[PDB]
């Protein structure tokens, strides 16, 4: 029961899925062969007659490489070969290929496997889609799949984990085009989307893990902790609390306003020494430091519509409430006049678990703060401007158009973004 299917599109989506699913095994004492020595984890891993615990996951990519590294990787046995789908030719960092030209050739084979995982669901909660904003696969294929699942599964819950493009973390010239087209196409088919600014994950790995030039593994591992912390309330069942979908009600006031900002804490280097440990009040205040934000934005300069705290480890209501109080005095946490100022809290038993030979240290207690601030709209504006610069001179546009796209599909997509921007202005009005 309460089943959840994870779909991983493109290079970013797949690589993250690996960081996620690895941690998940560790989180649940599971071994990489599928076997294991609270039945709430079954929401993410299906079980077989042989006793193997196979993830409720689909790995898709228009080119073979990334997926082949898993088909040969240390977890070749953790999944079903059928559930790791690949094309031959990729999307060449072009949405129009990912969406149309190249995706058209895989979509039905992809959807067919989701249907077979859907069958093994006594009562499916919905889908978790991991993708990049800038890849041709991450943008195009994801939007095609989202559209398609909204026919196939109708209004069934669709969640996102989208990697926001940053200059420092690879990136390509056309990425703004890819990210704007994908936001527009998915906007309806999405019920909730968690943005992940690569710069922020770069900044955190630099400033806290002390890594001068962080790897994809380094970022993805940090990301997996945050993602697992968000999904903890679904693989575990504790009396303490643990309760997503509820957060999601407070987090989403209106349908288009479905982008929470994660503010994960504490990020500690695996060579910190004396370190041990941090109080609930340290970790709670940490959530209000912009240095811990999943997306680089300014919510000290933006009004609030929600605030959720997701504790895990060795947390007790006394200090949580005592902490919440210390914060609730300070005037930088300005909520709107149309919604309450309470902070929805959730608490887990299972503390954050660490990866064998990791970059992070093992914390007794961790928190993730999901909030609905008008400051997330900056990430939009940031991206929109970059788009605006090139589109003005129609730079690179021809590669899209050559794949069957229209200039209008860019106007429409941009107008929708300006509406999403206007909508975040309108919402912060008192």
């Amino acid at each position: 029961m309460r089943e959840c299917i994870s779909i991983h599109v493109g290079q970013a989506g797949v690589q993250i899925g690996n960081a996620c699913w690895e941690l998940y095994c560790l989180e649940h004492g599971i071994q990489p062969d599928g076997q294991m020595p609270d039945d709430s984890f079954n929401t993410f891993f299906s079980e077989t007659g042989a006793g193997k615990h196979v993830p409720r996951a689909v790995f898709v990519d228009l080119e073979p490489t990334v997926i082949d590294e898993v088909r040969t990787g240390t977890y070749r046995q953790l999944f079903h070969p059928e559930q790791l789908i690949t094309g031959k030719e990729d999307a060449a960092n072009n949405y129009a290929r990912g969406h149309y030209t190249i995706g058209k050739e895989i979509i039905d084979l992809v959807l067919d496997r989701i249907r077979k995982l859907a069958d093994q669901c006594t009562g499916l909660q919905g889908f978790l889609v991991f993708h990049s904003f800038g890849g041709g696969t991450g943008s195009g294929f994801t939007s095609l799949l989202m559209e398609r699942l909204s026919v196939d599964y109708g209004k069934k819950s669709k969640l996102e984990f989208s990697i926001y493009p940053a200059p420092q973390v690879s990136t390509a010239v056309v990425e703004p085009y890819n990210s704007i087209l994908t936001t527009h196409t998915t906007l309806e088919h999405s019920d909730c989307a968690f943005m992940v600014d690569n710069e922020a994950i770069y900044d955190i790995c630099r400033r806290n893990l002390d890594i001068e030039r962080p790897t994809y593994t380094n970022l993805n591992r940090l990301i997996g902790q945050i993602v697992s912390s968000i999904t903890a309330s679904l693989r575990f069942d504790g009396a303490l609390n643990v309760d997503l979908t509820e957060f999601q009600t407070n987090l989403v006031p209106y349908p288009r306003i479905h982008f929470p900002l994660a503010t994960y804490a504490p990020v500690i280097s695996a060579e910190k020494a004396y370190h041990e440990q941090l109080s609930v009040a340290e970790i709670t205040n940490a959530c209000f430091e912009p240095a811990n934000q999943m997306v680089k934005c300014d919510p000290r300069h933006g009004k609030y519509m929600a605030c959720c705290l997701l504790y895990r480890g060795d947390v007790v209501p006394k200090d949580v409430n005592a902490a919440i109080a210390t914060i609730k005095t300070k005037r930088t946490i300005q909520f709107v006049d149309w919604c309450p100022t309470g902070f929805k809290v959730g608490i887990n038993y299972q503390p954050p678990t660490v990866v064998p030979g990791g970059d992070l240290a093992k914390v007794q207690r961790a928190v993730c703060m999901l909030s609905n601030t008008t400051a997330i709209a900056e990430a939009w504006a940031r991206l929109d401007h970059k788009f605006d610069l090139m589109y003005a001179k129609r730079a690179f546009v021809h590669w899209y158009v050559g794949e069957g796209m229209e200039e209008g599909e860019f106007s429409e997509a941009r107008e929708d973004m300006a509406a999403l921007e206007k909508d975040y202005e309108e919402v912060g009005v008192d």
Binding site: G123, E246, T249, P253, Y254, P317, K318, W338, G342
Partner: protein, 428 residues
């Protein structure tokens, strides 16, 4: 004979606590066997428990939830064994704190299934009094499905009476934003369908626990403890043979002067803390003023704001009936502005020689005060804040609902406040 229904997380916890406090007060152990001292207990056992021969006593309790979570808590709980396995009616899609889910989409898929159980349980009654619903007004199951059950029952048993234990949402206890939307939709249904409604306020349950019980970190256990106490106190005259010797319909006819004005302000004296510590008896005047004071009302209203249309008060244990009568008449003399003159002899006492569990002297208030409109103004305001901007409505329109249904529920509840108003300003 009364049929007991408990709906949602709140309702099933509240209900489980009533059923264990009263099980001790009637000498029924968690297995369902009489081991009590006086035969005075088994005299009025036929109101709540049935037989199996046995002798085995099964509570006339129907358990409803849209997810198993809470049902299993009860099952795995101490007294949880006593319940008819064939009476646990549950789904798997939790309604998730959405009135429209519990009341329409999800609930409807389990309503007929529940009704069959009530149908069965009512047939095994010589003559039935009415119904007992324990539920929260801010969730989805108790809020939505619980109101749906009341509507459906009203259609099947029109003549039978509707009694409810309706817990009021507060921003103090529970952070879900939508609670005001649910309660306003729930209240609209209660105004029209119940006969007597015990307005248990979480605002007040928390403040009592905090400011007064000196509980720095109040838990649901502590909050529910006061509720269980009051439920046994408001059902003292039903499940116990004394000079009264009355019922549900008689209570309603005498407590309810006007139809809609059927929402009561529960009370209690003394305000006991969980387990710790007991010791030292209370005098009758110490008991009376406590119970008649706002620092004891299970509803967040100041009674010195309105006027009591009708008052009810059950005293427990060995006390001087003289002393009791003496203080009540003194109270009505002193605070005569806050009692309606145009309803004579409107304050009603009751005594019962058997003291409650642990504490050897109790008092349980029930006021039908115009002050209750303050609990509604509160709910209406929280509703309006979000509603003027149409916030969180998508969650409801997604379940088939219309904006009109919200516009009406508020209107109808504002009309209820203007109704409580009329008699607050009225004299002889």
């Amino acid at each position: 004979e009364i049929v007991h229904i408990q709906a949602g997380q709140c309702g099933n916890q509240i209900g489980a606590k009533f059923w264990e406090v009263i099980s001790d007060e009637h000498g029924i152990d968690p297995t369902g066997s009489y081991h009590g001292d006086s035969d005075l207990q088994l005299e009025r056992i036929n109101v709540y428990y049935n037989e199996a021969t046995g002798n085995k006593y099964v509570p006339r309790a129907i358990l409803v939830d849209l997810e198993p979570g809470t049902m299993d808590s009860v099952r795995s709980g101490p007294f949880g064994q006593i319940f008819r396995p064939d009476n646990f009616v549950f789904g798997q899609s939790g309604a998730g704190n959405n009135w429209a889910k519990g009341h329409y989409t999800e609930g409807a898929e389990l309503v007929d299934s529940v009704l069959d159980v009530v149908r069965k349980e009512s047939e095994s009654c010589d003559c039935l009094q009415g119904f007992q619903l324990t539920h929260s007004l801010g969730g989805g199951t108790g809020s939505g499905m619980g109101t749906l059950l009341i509507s459906k029952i009203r259609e099947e048993y029109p003549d039978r009476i509707m009694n409810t234990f309706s817990v009021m949402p507060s921003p103090k206890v529970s952070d879900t934003v939508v609670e005001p939307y649910n309660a306003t939709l729930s209240v609209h249904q209660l105004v029209e369908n119940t006969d007597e409604t015990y307005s248990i306020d979480n605002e007040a349950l928390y403040d009592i626990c905090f400011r007064t019980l000196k509980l720095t970190t109040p838990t649901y256990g502590d909050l529910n403890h006061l509720v269980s106490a009051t439920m046994s106190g408001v059902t003292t005259c039903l499940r116990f043979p004394g000079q009264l010797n009355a019922d549900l319909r008689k209570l309603a006819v005498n407590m309810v002067p006007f139809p809609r004005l059927h929402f009561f302000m529960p009370g209690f004296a003394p305000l006991t803390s969980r387990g710790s510590q007991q010791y030292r008896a209370l005098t009758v005047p110490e008991l009376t003023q406590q119970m008649f004071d706002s620092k004891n009302m299970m509803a967040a209203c100041d009674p010195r704001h309105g006027r009591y249309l009708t008052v009810a008060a059950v005293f427990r244990g060995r006390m001087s009936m003289k002393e009791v009568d003496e203080q009540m008449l003194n109270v009505q003399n002193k605070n005569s502005s806050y009692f309606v003159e145009w309803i004579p002899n409107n304050v009603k006492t009751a005594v019962c020689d058997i003291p409650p569990r642990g504490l050897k002297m109790s008092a349980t208030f029930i006021g039908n005060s115009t002050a209750i409109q303050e609990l509604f103004k509160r709910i209406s305001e929280q509703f309006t804040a979000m509603f003027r901007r149409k916030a969180f409505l998508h969650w409801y329109t997604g379940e088939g609902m219309d904006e009109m249904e919200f516009t009406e529920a508020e209107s109808n509840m504002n009309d209820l406040v203007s109704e409580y108003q009329q008699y607050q300003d009225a004299t002889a």
